Amino acid sequence: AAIVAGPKQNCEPDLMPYARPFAVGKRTCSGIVGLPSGSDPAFSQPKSVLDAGLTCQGASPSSVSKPILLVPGTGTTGPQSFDSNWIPLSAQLGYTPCWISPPPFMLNDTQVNTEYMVNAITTLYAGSGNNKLPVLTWSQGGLVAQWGLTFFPSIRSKVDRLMAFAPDYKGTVLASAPSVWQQTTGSALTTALRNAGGLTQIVPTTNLYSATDEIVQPQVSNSPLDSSYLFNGKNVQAQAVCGPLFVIDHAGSLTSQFSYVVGRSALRSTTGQARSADYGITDCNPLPAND
Amino acid sequence: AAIVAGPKQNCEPDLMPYARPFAVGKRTCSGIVGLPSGSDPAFSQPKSVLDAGLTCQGASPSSVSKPILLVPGTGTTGPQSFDSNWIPLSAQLGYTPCWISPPPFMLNDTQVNTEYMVNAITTLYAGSGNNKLPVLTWSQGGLVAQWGLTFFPSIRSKVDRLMAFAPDYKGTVLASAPSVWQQTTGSALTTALRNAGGLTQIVPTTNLYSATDEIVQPQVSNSPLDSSYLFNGKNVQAQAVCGPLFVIDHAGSLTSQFSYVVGRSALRSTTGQARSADYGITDCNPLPAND
Ligand SMILES: CC(=O)N[C@@H]1[C@@H](O)[C@H](O)[C@@H](CO)O[C@@H]1O
Ligand SMILES: CC(=O)N[C@@H]1[C@@H](O)[C@H](O)[C@@H](CO)O[C@@H]1O
Ligand SMILES: CC(=O)N[C@@H]1[C@@H](O)[C@H](O)[C@@H](CO)O[C@H]1O
Ligand SMILES: CC(=O)N[C@@H]1[C@@H](O)[C@H](O)[C@@H](CO)O[C@H]1O
Ligand SMILES: *[PH](O)(CCCCCC)OC
Ligand SMILES: *[PH](O)(CCCCCC)OC
C-alpha cells in the first residue's frame, strides 16, 4: 500500500501459454515468440487423393533426385503454370521438376490446396533421402506455401527455401470460386494468416513482384504494405531495381528474364535468399527467360 | 483435367478448426467467426491472493446488491483512481461501488492484473444473485477488461456492459514497469489482443476518450486508428461532439462532467451503450462532475 514505482524490467513479460500463439515474431523476456510446434492438423482429404495431385518429371516422388516443388497459381495446373518456364528452367539448373495440381485448377478451398503441398513436401523430403528441398511458387502458390509453413509444423524443417513469384499473402483488392473469396483482401483466410504470424518468413524466402501486377494489388509501395512482402524476407519489387519504366505483369513476374536471374540467385544462394550482388540493371529484361 | 471455372459460391469457405481462432469477427459460409469458448485458462495466482485485491464499499463481494466493478489505471489503486469520482458517483446512481487494486499499483504483468478482474467478476456475479454486472474502467483498466473478455470465456455472460474511459487497447506510442512495457504500442501483449480478435467489442461497450490525451496516443482521428476504438462499440471521442476547443486530458476523460453524462447514459441504456440522444453541446463541460 506504499511506494511501488519500483517494478522495473529491461524486457516485456512473457505471454502466458494461452496468448503466445497470437504474438508470433514479437520479443519478450525469454526471446522471440516462435510459431506453435505441436502435431500437424489432420487432413480432410484421403492421402491417396492428395498423392494423385503430385507429379515429378521423369521420376517418382517416392524416389527422386534433387527435387524442387512447384506450386501453381489460381485457375491453373502445375503444367499450365510452369511448362513454358520453371519446369524446363529448373531441370536445366540440375533439379528434378515436381509439382502439384490441386483440383479443380486451384479454384477450391486454399486450405485443401495446402494439404496437397504439405503431403508433397513430406513425400519428396523422404523420397530424396530425407533432404530438404526448395519450393517455388506463383501467385496463390505462395499463399499456400506460407499457410502450410504456418499451420503444419512438420514441414518447416523439410523446406530449405521458398522462392515466391507474385505471392498474394494479403490477398488482392482487385477481387466466385472458393479460393477467389479467400484471396480477396480482408478475407477470413488472409486475416488468419496474418494473425497467426504468417507475414514473417518462416524459412529463407525471396518474394519477387511487380508494382504493375494487374491481378495482385497493392504492390506499389516497395514496403510492408505490399501484398507480396514478408518480414525478414528478401523482398524484390521489380521497379525498385529497374525503375518505373520496367513493366512486367502478373505472369511476367514469373517468366521474365529478370525473374529468372533473381530466382536462379535464390536457388543457388547459401543464405537461401536471392542476393543483390547477383542481379542489376542489365538483368532488367521483360522478355521471357525460357525464350 | 477439363473446364473448372465452375466452383462458384456466395460465401467464403469456413476456416478449419486450427485456423478459426485467428479470424474472429470475420464472416464465412457458416456465419461470423466467434471467439473460442473452451475452459478458462488457469490462474497463476492463488485465489486467496486474488480475493485480497477485491473490495466493495459498505458490503462484501460475496453478498452485494447491484455491484459495479471499477478497474483502475496504471500506477494507482482503485481508491486512488475513483475516490474523487466514480465511487461516489456510482453510489449516487444506485450501485454498490466495488473495485480491484492489483498490486503493486497495477504496475505488474497485465495478464496477472486481469486475473484479479476475472476472479472479481466471478465473485460479484454470484454475490449479486447470479446477475450480470457492469464494468467501468480507466486507462489500462479497459485493456484489462477486454483482455479478460477475450481470453476467459466464463465471464462473457457475466458482464452486462463495459464503460471504458481512455482505454489503451492499442497501447500508447508515448511510452520500465512490466505493464508499461506491455502498454507500449507494438508490444507482444497488444499484438496478441488484436490478433485474437480483441479489438471488436465482446459485450456492449462504450469508449470515451480525448484527442488531447497526454498519456494515450494516437487518439486524434475519431476512427479505428485510435487506441480507444473498438469495432461495433460506441466510440465517443470528446472533440467529435464538442469541437477542437474542448480540452480534457487523460484523467479528465474519466472525471469531467461530459464524461459523467456519457457514462450515466451507458449505465442506464437498455442497449448497454451510451446513446447520442442523451448528450450534446451543453454537456461539453470540462469541469469535474463530482464537483
Ligand atoms: C475436388 C473437386 O474438384 N471437387 C470438389 C467437390 O467435391 C466439393 O463438393 C466442392 C465443395 O467442397 O469443392 C470441389 O468442387
Ligand atoms: C505481487 C507483487 O507486487 N510483487 C510481484 C513480485 O512478487 C514478482 O516477483 C514480480 C515479478 O513477477 O512482480 C511483482 O513485483
Ligand atoms: C497506403 C499507402 O500509404 N501506401 C502508399 C501507396 O499508396 C503509394 O502508391 C506508394 C508510392 O510508391 O507509397 C505508399 O506509401
Ligand atoms: C495515421 C493517420 O492517417 N491518421 C490520421 C491522423 O494522423 C490525423 O491527425 C487525423 C486528423 O484528425 O486523421 C487521421 O486520418
Ligand atoms: P493468382 O493465384 C491470385 C489470384 C487472385 C484471385 C482474384 C482475382 O493468379 C494466377
Ligand atoms: P493508463 O493506465 C495508460 C498507461 C500507459 C503507460 C505508459 C506511459 O494511465 C493511468
UniProtKB/Swiss-Prot annotation, chains A, B:
SUPFAM superfamilies: alpha/beta-Hydrolases
Annotated S-S bridges: C11-C29, C56-C98, C242-C284
Keyword vocabulary terms for this entry: Cleavage on pair of basic residues, Disulfide bond, Glycoprotein, Hydrolase, Lipid degradation, Lipid metabolism, Signal, Zymogen
EC number(s) recorded for this UniProt protein: 3.1.1.3
Active site, UniProt feature: S139, D213, H250
Keyword Magnesium on entry: no
GO biological-process terms attached to the record: lipid catabolic process
Reactions catalysed according to its record: a triacylglycerol + H2O = a diacylglycerol + a fatty acid + H(+)
Top-level taxon of the source organism: Eukaryota
UniProt function note: Hydrolysis of triglycerides. Is very stereospecific both in hydrolysis and in organic synthesis and has a potentially important application in glucolipid synthesis.
PANTHER family the record matches: LIPASE B
Listed name of the protein: Lipase B
Classification of source organism: Eukaryota, Fungi, Dikarya, Basidiomycota, Ustilaginomycotina
